[PDB]
Write an enzyme that holds these catalytic residues in place. Structure first.
Site, PDB file in Angstrom:
ATOM      1  N   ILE A   1       0.869  -1.191   0.000  1.00  0.00           N
ATOM      2  CA  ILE A   1       0.000   0.000   0.000  1.00  0.00           C
ATOM      3  C   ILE A   1       0.900   1.233   0.000  1.00  0.00           C
ATOM      4  O   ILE A   1       0.420   2.258  -0.472  1.00  0.00           O
ATOM      5  CB  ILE A   1      -0.910   0.049   1.232  1.00  0.00           C
TER       6      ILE A   1
ATOM      7  N   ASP B   1      -0.371   4.314  -5.757  1.00  0.00           N
ATOM      8  CA  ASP B   1      -1.069   5.582  -5.694  1.00  0.00           C
ATOM      9  C   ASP B   1      -2.491   5.397  -5.225  1.00  0.00           C
ATOM     10  O   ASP B   1      -3.400   6.041  -5.753  1.00  0.00           O
ATOM     11  CB  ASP B   1      -1.052   6.243  -7.101  1.00  0.00           C
TER      12      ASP B   1
ATOM     13  N   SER C   1      -7.314   7.099  -3.429  1.00  0.00           N
ATOM     14  CA  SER C   1      -6.719   7.339  -4.734  1.00  0.00           C
ATOM     15  C   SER C   1      -5.846   8.567  -4.484  1.00  0.00           C
ATOM     16  O   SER C   1      -6.384   9.580  -4.070  1.00  0.00           O
ATOM     17  CB  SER C   1      -7.717   7.627  -5.837  1.00  0.00           C
ATOM     18  N   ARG C   2      -4.558   8.429  -4.634  1.00  0.00           N
ATOM     19  CA  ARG C   2      -3.698   9.580  -4.344  1.00  0.00           C
ATOM     20  C   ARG C   2      -3.675  10.577  -5.484  1.00  0.00           C
ATOM     21  O   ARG C   2      -3.030  11.618  -5.358  1.00  0.00           O
ATOM     22  CB  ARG C   2      -2.325   9.109  -3.906  1.00  0.00           C
ATOM     23  N   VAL C   3      -4.406  10.286  -6.549  1.00  0.00           N
ATOM     24  CA  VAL C   3      -4.478  11.176  -7.708  1.00  0.00           C
ATOM     25  C   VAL C   3      -5.680  12.120  -7.559  1.00  0.00           C
ATOM     26  O   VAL C   3      -5.674  13.279  -8.031  1.00  0.00           O
ATOM     27  CB  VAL C   3      -4.444  10.445  -9.053  1.00  0.00           C
TER      28      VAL C   3
END
Lengths: 48, 492, 467, 466
Positions: B325, B329, B354-356
């Site tokens: 993890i 992303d 969601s790191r986007v």
């Protein structure tokens, strides 16, 4: 008042039983973590 | 003067067991180079020791015996790459296994290449539509992004990946070459009949045409299973480095770690935490860093990865689970509790991320699902805090009323990836409150009815939302009109 | 001297010198390579053979390959011409903008400041973040640590601090990415530029960058922090300036070491770590410090393996900090961002003598009630809430509202929250909490307090919610 | 070739050869012994020495003793003449009925069928067991696994299945007893004789038996599976036959592996198991499969150590099955048999497009209500039902009635249930469960549903309970 008495008798007795079980679960877990953590150290050391 | 077997370019097996050859000689081998065994069996030079070379064997070591001649190849391990592989099923080295003939490969690529640095990339901005509301609305995936699918056995992790591969026909059958997405599906440690089942469905969906399937199954040697991911990655970089777009599924990275662990212990490298090599993080970071978005200066192509990891007893805090993890992303966490409860996909809103963010979302979608994620998080909490209707106000009664309705809309069946405008239409209905008075039980049925209506009658609004890519003021007005009226006739 | 490679096993390479054995820490360069490969000497195995850690990939190396002792530890370009640039573990530009023409060069290995070099000034450093400020204030020149398991907010928090503090800071900044995501160095670089903190045309750059990401071999990861820290020490000592140091994530330095440890022939300590973890961490952490010459304000992200704060690494790092922000997946899971744990975060300046009693009584006031509520949580869970004393169901109330008032929409997470970022001033914070604690909003709904800046937005939001 | 015994440690015999070193997997015969002692080569330690695994006790061996390369791997009698016979790891009869006179011999080590050889037909295999059929249906030519801690029902379930399925199967069956009780082999053999699946008079036997029980040295237990396996492979490919393959217990093969692994000198992996655990399960599990040539329906009992399903052994086995029946001590202790965990058993056939939506909706219906009951349980546990919602109490009623209706009397367990074994037809199961779900029996008492076949019997029991 007779039903609250009864219901609270049970609740209290269930609690205690739960207490007795969690405690025993706690010790089993406590022993396995130590054993587990120690075997891990030994494995690494022996491989050298 | 027979000089064919000098100890500089050749060696002789000192001993062999459990897939590890201890070759004598091979004085000029390079770390990580491929070597050949008398038996046509290939291996890879991992330990270059003072007196021997530890060679990992890509196959059954039963054909190798003490004394065998081992020959350098002069080449660091690589594999076939390129468009020829599409629609084909290859093993971890590139060889076909669909017995459909040789691959017509003209290019090759090293399986182990460092990921492009800082300078060659550009922020992820183009969506990678899964076809799954829950995902495309709450944990958006952009191209060049790495998003993990994680959960216990049977919680539906592969399905997310299949639906995604299948959803790509939309663009692949289309005109635009920038919207196309070639897919790669790497099976690792899996079972041959399952993969065979898998490639069947893909064929039946007319998806094989744009998919490559690298298979490194249960009976394949540990080193094949280990390599498989890097192999498949390299085939995906071909597209990434040539302004094309690729999507790779690593199913799963758990079985690879085991393979790595095995290969590694058999080389006598001291075991580490949990018995795995001290570098299992590195094992996966190296790989997943390769999924990336290149700038126009480098073709603007990309590689998107969807690695799978299996948890045990839904424990995501576990060392491996968190190791992975902490590389990707974001993650999609599937729970068996939710699954049994009827919530399929079993996506756990709260724990997935969601790191986007919305940068990987169309404005239509951003418009409708911009705050929904934290709303559902906050909903799950109060839904728990009142599992005893504790003199609850209105703001929270409204919160529980939206929460439940929205939860029903994010539900979804299998193999029916929806089109972006279709998602926007249905989420819209919920997020706007038009469904706050419908009965939760009704919601699923309503969505099938409603979607039917707009798809058939209204494709002008669908094609505009889809085209403009946004929800204009009139589209938003044509939509309010449709839902409210259809809803009424619907609740007759 | 010239040695030969005798063994290659991963990132570890053994070298045999015929004459003149390079001292430990010395950097050696492998001859015959398209790219520069540096090997740091790690040990003297004896028999004129040294064991070393590679600063890059070991593919294609050959037994017998030549290696020259460079005669000194890794030395990097240090000075003002590093600002606005991107460097390597070994000091090479990686931004494609040409050489870094510094007057001097510094070795990344150096002794930490002596005890008589320490400073003890303690000034609160306001950040605009409700939670931090209220309960665990950062201190100018102090050591700050953001603790968190995978994906709980360490970096975003580092991102909003760069915005709310680094951006106005009159002094340099050094951001060292240690074993983190490459995508991220590209997001930050381009953000620095779009906001002029990095200037590609002139010398107005106020931030130097150093990177050794997750796609690197253990060796690089075990040293970038050193490179980063070395750049920062220059501005501290040789210029005497006020530096801001950002490291994300220092855990990576320690994981790097554990990854080669076994190949260095060591019996593992507990949890798999190397036996030299603490000392390895000590000789490093002790350089990241403010002295009488200059001041460093280090913000270090600290990864927490398996989410276990007792893990030898996170566990060993607490002692090196003056303030700690502990993030929790249990809080995050509820949608409360930043997910700081109000009862596990601390600051050495949370002293009435330093922040004042109003600041102090509020903070502790907020913590008592959250603690009071934590204890009841498990119990009203089962036994329900009716039996509770109105005295106790009010603290459940206020606590749940405070729990929310502590969240805040960051300006670097609009892509995440769908909310405009708010920066709240220290007095707006103290006051807002003071009033909630005072019973002055027992009428507004909890939800009104969620994802808002100042208390007035909670009041406005109540109305908007009023229907 | 003749080698000499250099070292002996338990089942790991190291033999040195002067001319002609035998390849790995080759079987060597130790010389100078009252009975056959086969050694299977495991690896070339170099120096003309081979490390091997004995197939029987090694007591009495002596360093310097002579060993002879058999020239091939353990080979065993394969063909129809094995039907009705009991055989060893090394293929010798152990039923005191003479030699197994076969035309061909097969080696126990083979490669797994290729990808192109795989099959994908998915047919449901009805067993007459309510829980299995409704919730985790088996499939013809599929791979089934029954997970169970000690004494939970693995063997009784295999027996009942042998009864309900094997007995009326056109085609052959192979029972491979791996590391289990000898008395059980004996209990079965004689039972098979009695119902006539084993006929000692004619050639009409439909079962071949292979055994390597709890009393054998590790190496024997480590290979008998391969041996039963080979027998089955013959009928599949050499006769295109539809086979049935029962194994009790496949966990024992892995355990056996862990027993010799240290002796082979390997650094252990987690929990002391051998680092080669998965690959060993793999190249073995991958031959137990249906193909284009023949069908193998295989049912394997999987013993779960200390009841821990996270144990490397069982943990690594899930991935090889198509259907799994996870047995539970907790359920067993409630008196529910078979003690199947309804929310933990699964089947790749539980697809609407295969079992029909009627089946698919009752199935998911039952699980949803039991999942719901499951979350209420924590509170029910301290405070009971009083504080429960009228609505919640109805899930609880229904869940407890569904839980009881999932239990059922097996012929094989008649001596313990005190009741006559029942076989319920699928449509009877789909139905009975519908009604329960649908509230058509909210008036009956729970006890009415316990230990019965069809729902119709649950109504009756209710009258008798009055």
């Amino acid at each position: 008042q007779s039903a609250r008495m009864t219901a609270m008798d049970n609740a209290s007795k269930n609690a205690s039983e739960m207490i007795d079980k969690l405690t025993l679960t706690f010790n089993r877990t406590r022993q396995a973590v130590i054993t587990k953590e120690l075997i891990e150290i030994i494995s690494g050391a022996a491989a050298l | 003067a027979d000089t064919s077997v000098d100890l500089e370019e050749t060696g002789r097996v000192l001993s062999i067991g459990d897939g590890i050859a201890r070759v004598h000689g091979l004085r000029n081998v390079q770390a990580e180079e491929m070597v050949e065994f008398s038996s046509g069996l290939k291996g890879m030079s991992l330990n270059l020791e003072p007196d021997n070379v530890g060679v990992v064997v890509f196959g059954n070591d039963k054909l190798i015996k003490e004394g065998d001649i081992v020959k350098r190849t002069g080449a660091i391990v690589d594999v076939p790459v390129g468009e020829e592989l599409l629609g084909r099923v290859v093993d971890a080295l590139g060889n076909a296994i669909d017995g459909k003939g040789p691959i017509g490969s003209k290019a090759r690529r090293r399986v182990g290449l460092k990921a492009p640095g800082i300078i060659p990339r550009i922020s992820v901005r183009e969506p990678m539509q899964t076809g799954i509301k829950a995902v495309d609305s709450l944990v958006p995936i952009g191209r060049g992004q790495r998003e993990l699918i994680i959960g216990d056995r049977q919680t539906g992790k592969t399905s997310i990946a299949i639906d995604t591969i299948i959803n790509q026909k939309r663009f692949n059958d289309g005109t635009d070459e920038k919207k196309k997405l070639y897919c790669i599906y790497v099976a690792i440690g899996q079972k041959r009949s399952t993969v065979a089942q898998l490639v069947k469905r893909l064929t039946d969906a007319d998806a094989m045409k744009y998919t490559i399937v690298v298979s490194a199954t249960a009976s394949d040697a540990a080193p094949l299973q280990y390599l498989a991911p890097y192999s498949g990655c390299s085939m995906g970089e071909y597209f990434r480095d040539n302004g094309k777009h690729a999507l790779i599924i690593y199913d799963d990275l758990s079985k690879q770690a085991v393979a790595y662990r095995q290969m590694s212990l058999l080389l006598r490298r001291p075991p580490g935490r949990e018995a795995y090599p001290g570098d299992v993080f590195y094992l996966h970071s190296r790989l997943l860093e390769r999924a990336a978005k290149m700038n126009d200066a480098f073709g603007g192509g990309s590689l998107t990865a969807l690695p799978v990891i299996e948890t045990q007893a839904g424990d995501v805090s576990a060392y491996i689970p968190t190791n992975v993890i902490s590389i990707t992303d974001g993650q999609i966490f599937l729970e068996t509790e939710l699954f049994y409860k009827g919530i399929r996909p079993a996506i756990n809103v709260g724990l997935s991320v969601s790191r986007v963010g919305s940068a990987a979302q169309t404005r239509a979608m951003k418009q409708v699902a911009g705050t929904m994620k934290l709303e559902l998080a906050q909903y799950r909490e109060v839904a728990a805090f009142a599992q005893f209707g504790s003199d609850l106000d209105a703001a929270t009664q409204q919160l529980l009323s939206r929460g439940v309705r929205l939860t029903e809309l994010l539900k979804q069946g299998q193999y029916s990836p929806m089109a972006i405008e279709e998602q926007v239409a249905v989420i819209y209905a919920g997020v706007r409150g038009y469904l706050d008075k419908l009965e939760p039980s009704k919601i699923t049925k309503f969505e099938n009815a409603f979607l039917s209506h707009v798809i058939s009658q209204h494709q002008a609004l669908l094609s505009k939302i889809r085209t403009d890519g946004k929800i204009s003021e009139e589209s938003d007005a044509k939509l309010k009109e449709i839902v409210t009226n259809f809803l009424a006739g619907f609740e007759a | 001297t010239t040695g030969r490679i005798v063994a290659v096993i991963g990132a570890v390479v053994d070298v045999q010198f015929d004459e003149g054995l390079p001292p430990i820490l010395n950097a050696l360069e492998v001859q015959g390579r398209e790219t520069r490969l540096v090997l740091e000497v790690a040990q003297h195995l004896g028999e004129s053979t040294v064991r070393t850690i590679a600063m890059d990939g070991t593919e294609g190396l050959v037994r017998g390959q030549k290696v020259l002792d460079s005669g000194a530890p890794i030395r990097i370009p240090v000075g003002p011409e590093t600002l606005g640039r991107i460097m390597n573990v070994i000091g090479e530009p990686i931004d494609e903008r040409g050489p870094i023409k510094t007057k001097q060069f510094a070795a990344i290995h150096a002794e930490a400041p002596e005890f008589v070099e320490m400073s003890v000034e303690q000034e609160i450093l306001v950040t605009g973040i409700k939670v931090v400020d209220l309960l665990a204030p950062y201190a100018k020149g102090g050591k700050i640590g953001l603790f968190g398991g995978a994906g709980v907010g360490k970096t975003v928090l580092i991102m909003e601090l760069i915005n709310n503090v680094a951006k106005a800071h009159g002094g340099y900044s050094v951001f060292a990415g240690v074993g983190e995501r490459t995508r991220e160095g590209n997001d930050l670089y381009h953000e620095m530029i779009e906001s002029g903190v990095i200037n590609l045309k002139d010398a107005t750059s106020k931030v130097a960058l150093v990177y050794g990401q997750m796609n690197e071999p253990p060796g690089a990861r075990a040293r970038v922090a050193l490179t980063g820290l070395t750049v920062a020490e220059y501005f501290r000592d040789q210029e005497g300036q006020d530096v801001l140091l950002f490291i994300d994530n220092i855990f990576r330095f320690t994981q790097a070491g554990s990854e080669v440890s076994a190949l260095l022939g060591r019996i593992p300590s507990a949890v798999g770590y190397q036996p030299t973890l603490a000392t390895d961490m000590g000789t490093m952490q002790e350089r990241i410090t403010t002295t009488k010459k200059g001041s460093i304000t280090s913000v270090q992200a600290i990864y927490v393996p398996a989410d276990d704060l007792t893990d030898p690494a996170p566990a060993t790092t607490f002692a090196h900090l003056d303030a700690t922000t502990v993030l929790s997946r249990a809080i995050a899971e509820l949608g409360i961002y930043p997910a700081v744990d109000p009862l596990d975060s601390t600051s050495r300046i949370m002293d009435p003598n330093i922040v004042g009693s109003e600041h102090y009584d509020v903070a502790r006031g907020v913590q008592k009630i959250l603690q009071d509520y934590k204890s009841l949580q498990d119990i009203i869970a089962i036994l329900g809430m009716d039996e509770l004393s109105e005295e106790d169901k009010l603290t459940v109330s206020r606590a749940r509202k405070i729990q929310r008032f502590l969240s805040q929409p960051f300006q670097v997470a609009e892509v995440f929250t769908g909310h405009l970022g708010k920066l709240v001033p220290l007095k707006e914070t103290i006051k807002g909490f003071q009033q909630i604690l005072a019973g002055e909003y027992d009428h507004l709904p909890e939800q009104a307090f969620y994802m808002v800046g100042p208390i007035e937005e909670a009041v406005a939001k109540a109305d908007k919610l009023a229907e």
